[PDB]
Write a protein that holds these residues in place. Structure first.
Motif, PDB file in Angstrom:
ATOM      1  N   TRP A  13       0.832  -1.190   0.000  1.00  0.00           N
ATOM      2  CA  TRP A  13       0.000   0.000   0.000  1.00  0.00           C
ATOM      3  C   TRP A  13       0.873   1.249   0.000  1.00  0.00           C
ATOM      4  N   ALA A  14       1.830   1.286   0.915  1.00  0.00           N
ATOM      5  CA  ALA A  14       2.746   2.407   1.008  1.00  0.00           C
ATOM      6  C   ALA A  14       3.533   2.546  -0.290  1.00  0.00           C
ATOM      7  N   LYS A  17       1.573   4.131  -2.831  1.00  0.00           N
ATOM      8  CA  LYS A  17       1.336   5.560  -2.636  1.00  0.00           C
ATOM      9  C   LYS A  17       2.646   6.350  -2.589  1.00  0.00           C
ATOM     10  N   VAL A  19       4.945   5.773  -0.241  1.00  0.00           N
ATOM     11  CA  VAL A  19       5.352   5.803   1.157  1.00  0.00           C
ATOM     12  C   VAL A  19       6.108   4.534   1.540  1.00  0.00           C
ATOM     13  N   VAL A  24       7.384   5.007   8.847  1.00  0.00           N
ATOM     14  CA  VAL A  24       6.055   5.032   9.447  1.00  0.00           C
ATOM     15  C   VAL A  24       6.050   4.341  10.805  1.00  0.00           C
ATOM     16  N   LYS A  35      -3.011  -0.145   7.645  1.00  0.00           N
ATOM     17  CA  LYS A  35      -3.574   0.744   6.635  1.00  0.00           C
ATOM     18  C   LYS A  35      -3.955   2.087   7.251  1.00  0.00           C
ATOM     19  N   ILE A  38      -0.646   4.217   7.617  1.00  0.00           N
ATOM     20  CA  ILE A  38      -0.255   4.759   6.323  1.00  0.00           C
ATOM     21  C   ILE A  38      -1.196   5.889   5.917  1.00  0.00           C
ATOM     22  N   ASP A  39      -2.496   5.607   5.952  1.00  0.00           N
ATOM     23  CA  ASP A  39      -3.503   6.602   5.600  1.00  0.00           C
ATOM     24  C   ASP A  39      -3.325   7.858   6.446  1.00  0.00           C
ATOM     25  N   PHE A  41      -0.357   8.727   7.733  1.00  0.00           N
ATOM     26  CA  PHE A  41       0.932   9.274   7.333  1.00  0.00           C
ATOM     27  C   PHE A  41       0.754  10.292   6.214  1.00  0.00           C
ATOM     28  N   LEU A  42      -0.076   9.945   5.235  1.00  0.00           N
ATOM     29  CA  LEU A  42      -0.338  10.822   4.105  1.00  0.00           C
ATOM     30  C   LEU A  42      -1.311  11.930   4.490  1.00  0.00           C
ATOM     31  N   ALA A  43      -2.322  11.572   5.274  1.00  0.00           N
ATOM     32  CA  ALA A  43      -3.326  12.532   5.716  1.00  0.00           C
ATOM     33  C   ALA A  43      -3.023  13.034   7.124  1.00  0.00           C
ATOM     34  N   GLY A  45       0.088  15.120   7.612  1.00  0.00           N
ATOM     35  CA  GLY A  45       1.237  15.992   7.466  1.00  0.00           C
ATOM     36  C   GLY A  45       0.955  17.406   7.935  1.00  0.00           C
TER      37      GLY A  45
END
Length: 45
Positions: A13-14, A17, A19, A24, A35, A38-39, A41-43, A45
């Motif tokens: 997944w990372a 994307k 990542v 993480v 998940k 990760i989600d 990590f991106l959302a 920042g």
């Protein structure tokens, strides 16, 4: 500590994307990057 802890799908997944699990700090029980991590990590920042 050498190898990060996370689910195989999370790693894919990372990688999908752009990542890396290595960057993480998963909180899955013992720190497994799920998940959600990760989600976040991106959302997150």
């Amino acid at each position: 500590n050498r190898r990060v802890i996370a689910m195989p799908s999370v790693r894919k997944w990372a990688r999908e994307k752009g990542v890396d699990i290595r960057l993480v700090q998963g909180t899955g029980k013992n720190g497994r990057v799920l998940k959600e991590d990760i989600d976040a990590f991106l959302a997150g920042g």
